[PDB]
């Protein structure tokens, strides 16, 4: 036997951090789940039951507060980015370290149309993510996303001409509800190290807000032809808007709502152009996924 | 042995309905989950295997779609109402209707500043709920509510003065945080039947949102003594702004945000005026419940 | 406005405690989640921001640890009945105490057929749960029950004779799949005191035992006409069983398995006496509910 | 832009299927959830709108409910390597199909001592799962795997000898609680096609069996130096007992139980020797990786 691959850390580790704008009073609130895995030379822990390779897991929750502490925490790339790097310079035999991130909406409350200077609202499950590995002599590999985005439109999505054979029932349609809970990922262009992802950090935010705008822009004014068709169109507007991205992932389910036929009940019509009350199915469900590149 | 108290009937019942405009071209979506539990003259079934008295939970379920197809699904204290009275007054051994209904929310999306006429996002996990008791000869019993709006205040709460013993180990404070998920129940004065729930639709509405309101403005502004000391300020005030109403019920949970003491490394300061990371803690949580009524 | 009900603790307190036989070496583990919820003369908390009243929830938290080292956890209805008296006793102001207790199944591993004497599976989900409300000066109320318990049996379950009119469109059967979650509640005699419960704690494992073994006996055995007229039969005979026991309530989902229909593909027979392939449904589900007494 | 990689398909897709043996009467009853993705060339259908590329999800449900009905869908292993064959085989431009197949348990119900010829019961939430990949022209690739098997120790773990430096704040320890959910995958050989599976079919139960009791029998006997060191050693023994497994993956969350200083409290000794009364905690985690191949 031989130790193919090993990775280890702390999962699910819960961090709030605030900062105080003094001058206005103002409070702004972050909050987080943090997974820190590390990689190196760690094979004897798991072989000759040698404790002495291993960071404790104890220990890297600890350094995830005091680098919060002593840094920034957004852009969240930025924050995954010099804790993943401290693990690897502080400790000769780790060689790589995988950091997720996941953030927690905390927006502002406004009360009688003033933003409120620190009382906030979870106003969405949507979630702004990170993942950050940082491999020694290799630089620093980005995937930002954005997931449990849920929308729906309730018109302007078909879905026909698709192949039939003995195996399908389903009829085409060229008017059904669409609704999906949208999972999309860009990946950067590796950076050499810390220097070069501070020297973009701006790009972040900015980044973020593009693929969000342009998937609600593009997923609302889509006269849909199926979800490949218009997960595609995103992709490539969102390509076209940042030359630092390499490719763009979207993993989209078909969340199905289904037509009642209630004309057995003194003829109701509720099919058709006289559809009105839908079945929402909870499985099963479509899964349609795409990674989009340049050429 | 005897049967004392039995019910039955469909619950989870998913139900979306479309609403389209003909002249502007919009459309409006409403999604609920239903449950519809009857009582009465029942008891055969359960002694006997007489499911000759058993209107099938199939049926009901038939029932919930038939009557979103024919009548308005909002307000939902009106559709819960309509619907509590269909089975009392259809079926002569049914004596009682107890509906449930979960409303999820769907957001017109806004696309360069104009509202969408049929694109939607699930903008909070937070509902809006009723439960209407339909009691043969007792009338109609509406208790509507919010619930799952999750809050955050970064100072403006305080905890001191209470009671200390030789139990008690937590410190006294004069400035922390204070997270909630707010429930809020208002119990309608009882309605003779569905000519006076129709008699009030509008009320129904615009209370939901005063309750909304006034709970969001209170947590925001009220510089907190205690979670029962808020909670109370904004039962008081939705009370005074519906006459209809007899009672306010909320169940806060105190989600406890714990300060982190760095001193041991490298005397970082942490804690109390120096307090910026901060643990939340996934459990246990304090439950704050008050019913406030009139005197 | 005036306070018509308040309660407030400690939810989702997570207790783990170990026992150790010196003798034979053999350790037992006992895992569960704890709520208590205080009531009495705290008015003032909600309506003068008065903090004097309010026994900490950190302080009943600290008070759920010590009841556990002091005292055996074991049966839970003595714990919650030795926990709930312990808040009315001590301080002269709170009048009543509700103690919840869900208790997490932690089954002794068997090694080679060998019980092992410290380690221990997972076994089920399924949980037994007591609700002890101690009353000043009215006794001490324990409802007991067992939830998650998941059964399904393929064949001798049966629902025909229902009523059927314009709403029902369900084919009887003389042949179905029967699947459910079994939640079942007995409700003891009021005790008058902590001595009462004492002398009676043998009772309390036994009885637990004894429900859950007739549940899944008469599940398996009754050619069920109905959910309703199985449930009844479980009823009667626990009732039959224990003197101490006033009532017991079943709440029973009712988990459908629909046939599927291949007919369309090359005449397959997949329906009646042919069915072999179901979708299971998710959801709606009946819900069928009976509480039985004595008479 | 380029699509770099595309897949599609359904998900959740629930099955139940009984076996009736006529001799015996026995029944016996699988419920699995289904999702199968495809691969191939489909790229115009998100480049061009050209939806005649796409066999639709709703058809890849049917064919899920066909080859059930005409196959067997034990052992898992054998069931996904048909129903990923069929993908390819039956559809030209389809050139991989994914199927992940999670098996729910029914185990069947022992009433008196004799196993019940047609009542089961969800005895665990424990998972057996397959990831079958049938790649046109370069055979299938099938991972076996356990998940959601809780289990725990209450001594002989323990934790000492790992690095102390500037943010190591946790104790040595010779005795502690160990507790877990196994994931533990064993990925065979490359079989050529179907023939070759089906040559190996009684292999596959039997190696499952065998994964569970050396995984069980290891965590419960090794006096544990650490998560890494005992995983290895399940790992190991699984390779040596199944020449047809190339490599084995463990992941282990270290699920930490924390000793409760009482000793603020009347000096009660709840730590080292004295600890009785834990705080299981829910998050963080610790989260301990090993893939062990051969050498
Ligand atoms: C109705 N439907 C399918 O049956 N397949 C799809 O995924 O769900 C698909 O491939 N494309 C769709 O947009 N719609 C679908
Ligand atoms: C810190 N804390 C308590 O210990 N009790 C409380 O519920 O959580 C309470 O009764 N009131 C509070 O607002 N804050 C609390
Ligand atoms: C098929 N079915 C119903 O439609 N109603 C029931 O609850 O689900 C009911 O009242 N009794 C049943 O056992 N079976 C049912
Ligand atoms: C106490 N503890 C750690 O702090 N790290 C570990 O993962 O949780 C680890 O690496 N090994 C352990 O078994 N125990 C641990």
Same mark, same amino acid.
């Given at each position: ?10 999962d699910?580790?819960?961090?709030? *951090?605030?900062h ?43 350094t ?19 804790l993943?790097?401290? %693990? ?7 060689h ?21 200077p ?7 499950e949507?979630k702004?993510?990170?993942q950050?590995?940082?491999?020694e002599? *290799?630089?620093?590999?980005? *995937?930002?996303?954005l997931?449990? @985005? ?9 879905? =026909? ?12 349609? =060229? ?8 999972d999309?990922?860009?990946q ?5 190290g ?9 790009? %972040? ?13 593009? %997923? ?20 076209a808007?940042?030359?630092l991205?390499?490719t ?9 709502? %289904?037509?009642?036929? @209630?004309? =057995?009940? *003194? ?29």
């Amino acid at each position: 036997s031989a130790v193919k691959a090993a990775r280890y850390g702390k999962d699910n580790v819960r961090v709030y *951090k605030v900062h105080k704008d003094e001058k206005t009073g103002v409070q702004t609130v972050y909050e987080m789940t943090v997974c820190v895995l590390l990689e190196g030379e760690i094979e004897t822990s798991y072989t000759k039951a040698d404790n002495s390779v291993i960071v404790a897991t104890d220990s890297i929750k600890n350094t995830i507060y005091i680098t919060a502490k002593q840094n920034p925490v957004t852009p969240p790339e930025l924050f995954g980015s010099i804790l993943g790097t401290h %693990f690897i310079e502080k400790y000769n035999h780790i060689h790589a370290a995988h950091v997720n991130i996941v953030c927690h909406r905390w927006t502002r409350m406004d009360i009688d149309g003033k933003p409120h200077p620190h009382s906030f609202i979870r106003d969405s499950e949507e979630k702004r993510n990170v993942q950050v590995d940082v491999v020694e002599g *290799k630089g620093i590999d980005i *995937k930002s996303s954005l997931s449990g @985005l849920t929308v729906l439109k309730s018109t302007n999505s078909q879905f =026909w001409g698709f192949l039939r054979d003995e195996y399908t029932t389903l009829k085409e349609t =060229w008017d059904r509800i669409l609704s999906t809970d949208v999972d999309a990922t860009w990946q950067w262009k590796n950076f050499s190290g810390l220097q070069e992802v501070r020297s973009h950090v701006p790009k %972040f935010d900015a980044t973020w807000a593009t693929a969000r705008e342009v998937t609600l822009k593009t %997923f609302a004014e889509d006269n849909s032809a199926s979800v490949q068709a218009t997960m595609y169109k995103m992709a490539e507007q969102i390509l076209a808007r940042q030359q630092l991205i390499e490719t763009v992932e979207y993993s989209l389910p078909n969340k199905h709502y %289904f037509e009642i036929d @209630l004309s =057995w009940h *003194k003829g109701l019509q509720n099919t058709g152009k006289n559809a009105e009350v839908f079945a929402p199915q909870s499985d099963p469900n479509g899964l349609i996924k795409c990674t989009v590149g340049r050429s």
